[PDB]
PDB file of all heavy atoms in Angstrom:
ATOM      1  N   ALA C  41     -45.048  62.022 286.002  1.00 90.63           N
ATOM      2  CA  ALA C  41     -45.695  60.804 286.476  1.00 90.63           C
ATOM      3  C   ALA C  41     -44.921  59.552 286.089  1.00 90.63           C
ATOM      4  O   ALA C  41     -45.060  58.520 286.755  1.00 90.63           O
ATOM      5  CB  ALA C  41     -47.124  60.724 285.937  1.00 90.63           C
ATOM      6  N   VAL C  42     -44.108  59.619 285.036  1.00 93.48           N
ATOM      7  CA  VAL C  42     -43.273  58.484 284.661  1.00 93.48           C
ATOM      8  C   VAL C  42     -41.972  58.483 285.455  1.00 93.48           C
ATOM      9  O   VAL C  42     -41.530  57.437 285.941  1.00 93.48           O
ATOM     10  CB  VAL C  42     -43.013  58.497 283.144  1.00 93.48           C
ATOM     11  CG1 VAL C  42     -42.141  57.318 282.743  1.00 93.48           C
ATOM     12  CG2 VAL C  42     -44.325  58.479 282.380  1.00 93.48           C
ATOM     13  N   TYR C  43     -41.338  59.650 285.598  1.00 89.98           N
ATOM     14  CA  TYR C  43     -40.068  59.724 286.314  1.00 89.98           C
ATOM     15  C   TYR C  43     -40.235  59.370 287.787  1.00 89.98           C
ATOM     16  O   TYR C  43     -39.400  58.659 288.359  1.00 89.98           O
ATOM     17  CB  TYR C  43     -39.461  61.118 286.161  1.00 89.98           C
ATOM     18  CG  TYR C  43     -38.048  61.238 286.687  1.00 89.98           C
ATOM     19  CD1 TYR C  43     -36.960  60.893 285.897  1.00 89.98           C
ATOM     20  CD2 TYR C  43     -37.801  61.701 287.973  1.00 89.98           C
ATOM     21  CE1 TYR C  43     -35.667  61.003 286.372  1.00 89.98           C
ATOM     22  CE2 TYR C  43     -36.512  61.816 288.458  1.00 89.98           C
ATOM     23  CZ  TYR C  43     -35.450  61.466 287.654  1.00 89.98           C
ATOM     24  OH  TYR C  43     -34.165  61.578 288.134  1.00 89.98           O
ATOM     25  N   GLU C  44     -41.304  59.848 288.418  1.00 90.82           N
ATOM     26  CA  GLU C  44     -41.541  59.592 289.833  1.00 90.82           C
ATOM     27  C   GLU C  44     -42.396  58.356 290.079  1.00 90.82           C
ATOM     28  O   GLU C  44     -42.725  58.075 291.236  1.00 90.82           O
ATOM     29  CB  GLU C  44     -42.206  60.805 290.496  1.00 90.82           C
ATOM     30  CG  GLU C  44     -41.827  62.158 289.910  1.00 90.82           C
ATOM     31  CD  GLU C  44     -40.364  62.514 290.089  1.00 90.82           C
ATOM     32  OE1 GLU C  44     -39.677  61.864 290.905  1.00 90.82           O
ATOM     33  OE2 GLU C  44     -39.904  63.455 289.411  1.00 90.82           O
ATOM     34  N   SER C  45     -42.761  57.621 289.026  1.00 88.62           N
ATOM     35  CA  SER C  45     -43.606  56.431 289.140  1.00 88.62           C
ATOM     36  C   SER C  45     -44.942  56.755 289.807  1.00 88.62           C
ATOM     37  O   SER C  45     -45.445  55.995 290.636  1.00 88.62           O
ATOM     38  CB  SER C  45     -42.883  55.305 289.886  1.00 88.62           C
ATOM     39  OG  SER C  45     -43.738  54.195 290.087  1.00 88.62           O
ATOM     40  N   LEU C  46     -45.518  57.895 289.444  1.00 87.08           N
ATOM     41  CA  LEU C  46     -46.812  58.317 289.950  1.00 87.08           C
ATOM     42  C   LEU C  46     -47.893  58.042 288.906  1.00 87.08           C
ATOM     43  O   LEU C  46     -47.651  57.405 287.877  1.00 87.08           O
ATOM     44  CB  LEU C  46     -46.769  59.793 290.348  1.00 87.08           C
ATOM     45  CG  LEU C  46     -45.904  60.160 291.555  1.00 87.08           C
ATOM     46  CD1 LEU C  46     -46.088  61.626 291.905  1.00 87.08           C
ATOM     47  CD2 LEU C  46     -46.234  59.273 292.743  1.00 87.08           C
ATOM     48  N   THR C  47     -49.105  58.522 289.172  1.00 90.65           N
ATOM     49  CA  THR C  47     -50.246  58.324 288.291  1.00 90.65           C
ATOM     50  C   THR C  47     -50.724  59.670 287.765  1.00 90.65           C
ATOM     51  O   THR C  47     -50.981  60.590 288.547  1.00 90.65           O
ATOM     52  CB  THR C  47     -51.387  57.606 289.016  1.00 90.65           C
ATOM     53  OG1 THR C  47     -50.976  56.277 289.357  1.00 90.65           O
ATOM     54  CG2 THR C  47     -52.625  57.538 288.135  1.00 90.65           C
ATOM     55  N   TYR C  48     -50.835  59.777 286.443  1.00 91.43           N
ATOM     56  CA  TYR C  48     -51.375  60.971 285.802  1.00 91.43           C
ATOM     57  C   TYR C  48     -52.890  60.943 285.954  1.00 91.43           C
ATOM     58  O   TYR C  48     -53.566  60.108 285.344  1.00 91.43           O
ATOM     59  CB  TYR C  48     -50.956  61.013 284.337  1.00 91.43           C
ATOM     60  CG  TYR C  48     -51.342  62.277 283.606  1.00 91.43           C
ATOM     61  CD1 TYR C  48     -50.615  63.446 283.774  1.00 91.43           C
ATOM     62  CD2 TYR C  48     -52.423  62.298 282.735  1.00 91.43           C
ATOM     63  CE1 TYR C  48     -50.956  64.599 283.105  1.00 91.43           C
ATOM     64  CE2 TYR C  48     -52.772  63.451 282.060  1.00 91.43           C
ATOM     65  CZ  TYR C  48     -52.035  64.599 282.249  1.00 91.43           C
ATOM     66  OH  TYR C  48     -52.373  65.753 281.585  1.00 91.43           O
ATOM     67  N   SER C  49     -53.429  61.847 286.767  1.00 91.72           N
ATOM     68  CA  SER C  49     -54.824  61.754 287.172  1.00 91.72           C
ATOM     69  C   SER C  49     -55.370  63.141 287.476  1.00 91.72           C
ATOM     70  O   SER C  49     -54.625  64.114 287.609  1.00 91.72           O
ATOM     71  CB  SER C  49     -54.985  60.835 288.385  1.00 91.72           C
ATOM     72  OG  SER C  49     -56.324  60.834 288.836  1.00 91.72           O
ATOM     73  N   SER C  50     -56.694  63.215 287.588  1.00 90.12           N
ATOM     74  CA  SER C  50     -57.411  64.446 287.874  1.00 90.12           C
ATOM     75  C   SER C  50     -58.240  64.277 289.140  1.00 90.12           C
ATOM     76  O   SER C  50     -58.599  63.164 289.527  1.00 90.12           O
ATOM     77  CB  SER C  50     -58.320  64.846 286.708  1.00 90.12           C
ATOM     78  OG  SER C  50     -59.099  65.980 287.042  1.00 90.12           O
ATOM     79  N   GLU C  51     -58.554  65.401 289.780  1.00 89.11           N
ATOM     80  CA  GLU C  51     -59.233  65.409 291.070  1.00 89.11           C
ATOM     81  C   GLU C  51     -60.717  65.687 290.869  1.00 89.11           C
ATOM     82  O   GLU C  51     -61.088  66.695 290.258  1.00 89.11           O
ATOM     83  CB  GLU C  51     -58.617  66.452 292.004  1.00 89.11           C
ATOM     84  CG  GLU C  51     -57.149  66.220 292.341  1.00 89.11           C
ATOM     85  CD  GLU C  51     -56.205  66.717 291.260  1.00 89.11           C
ATOM     86  OE1 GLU C  51     -56.680  67.058 290.157  1.00 89.11           O
ATOM     87  OE2 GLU C  51     -54.983  66.770 291.516  1.00 89.11           O
ATOM     88  N   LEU C  52     -61.559  64.792 291.379  1.00 90.66           N
ATOM     89  CA  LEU C  52     -63.004  64.961 291.318  1.00 90.66           C
ATOM     90  C   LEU C  52     -63.488  65.604 292.613  1.00 90.66           C
ATOM     91  O   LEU C  52     -63.274  65.057 293.700  1.00 90.66           O
ATOM     92  CB  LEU C  52     -63.699  63.620 291.093  1.00 90.66           C
ATOM     93  CG  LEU C  52     -65.228  63.649 291.057  1.00 90.66           C
ATOM     94  CD1 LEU C  52     -65.726  64.546 289.936  1.00 90.66           C
ATOM     95  CD2 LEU C  52     -65.788  62.246 290.910  1.00 90.66           C
TER      96      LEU C  52
END
Side-chain angles (χ1 to χ4, degrees):
Chain C
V42 180
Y43 189 85
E44 328 295 345
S45 175
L46 292 186
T47 294
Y48 186 78
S49 175
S50 175
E51 298 81 349
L52 178 60

